[PDB]
């Protein structure tokens, strides 16, 4: 069986694009991330998502944004997509001024806390480091 994708709206696609960070994070400017953000905007436009691009949000702005989106009425929407483009650690995404737990963000959308998305696919696409291990690969 398949999710019902024929509601009047495919849904929102929120793209959070963090390029420049406070020096305290020690992250260097994420060159190339604007290309990703525009590629994503176009790709999801073509899938008939209502794309909202946000650039350079602090961690407080990320949470406030995700809380606000979770309190909208998604009744006429089939799905929800959030793309995070940032620095990260395992389980963590960076605002421009520091880390916030990914669970904090995704908990706004739990089945009991966002009832107009209950039973609907909630997609989190995350371009961010998850630690500092390096994969040297294996010849094939």
């Amino acid at each position: 069986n398949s999710y019902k994708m024929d509601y009047p709206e495919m849904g929102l696609c929120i793209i959070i694009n963090n390029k420049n960070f406070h020096k305290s994070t020690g992250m260097t400017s994420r060159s190339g991330t604007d290309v990703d953000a525009a590629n994503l905007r176009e790709t999801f436009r073509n899938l008939k998502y209502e794309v909202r691009n946000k650039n350079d949000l602090t961690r407080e702005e990320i949470v406030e944004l995700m809380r606000d989106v979770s309190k909208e009425d998604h009744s006429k929407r089939s799905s929800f997509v959030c793309v995070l483009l940032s620095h990260g650690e395992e389980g963590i995404i960076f605002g421009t001024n520091g880390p916030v737990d990914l669970k904090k963000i995704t908990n706004f959308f739990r089945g009991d806390r966002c009832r107009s998305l209950t039973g609907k696919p909630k997609l989190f696409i995350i371009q961010a480091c998850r630690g500092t291990e390096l994969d040297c690969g294996i010849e094939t």
């Binding site: 069986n1 994708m5 060159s31 395992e90 009991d112 696919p121 997609l123 989190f124 995350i126 291990e133």
Partner: protein, 93 residues
Amino acid sequence: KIPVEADFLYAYSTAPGYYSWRNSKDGSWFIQSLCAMLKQYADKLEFMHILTRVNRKVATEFESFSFDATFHAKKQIPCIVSMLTKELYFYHH
């Protein structure tokens, strides 16, 4: 009732514990590959199958190029985390 954690999909660019790679001109390897596979297959394939092709493209077609030997010739595999309870098609019918 359904579990409150059901119907989430986390499409991570890299495996737990690892760095994720980004080309300074072309963008991150994962999003480059994700947009390309959506463009090609969203009209046809179920989303997990699209993400498996993204896994393959990232795994096989990219390797890092760095002036720092420590970071040179490295590889990446994305990580699909699915709590979905149904197949996802971006078209209808």
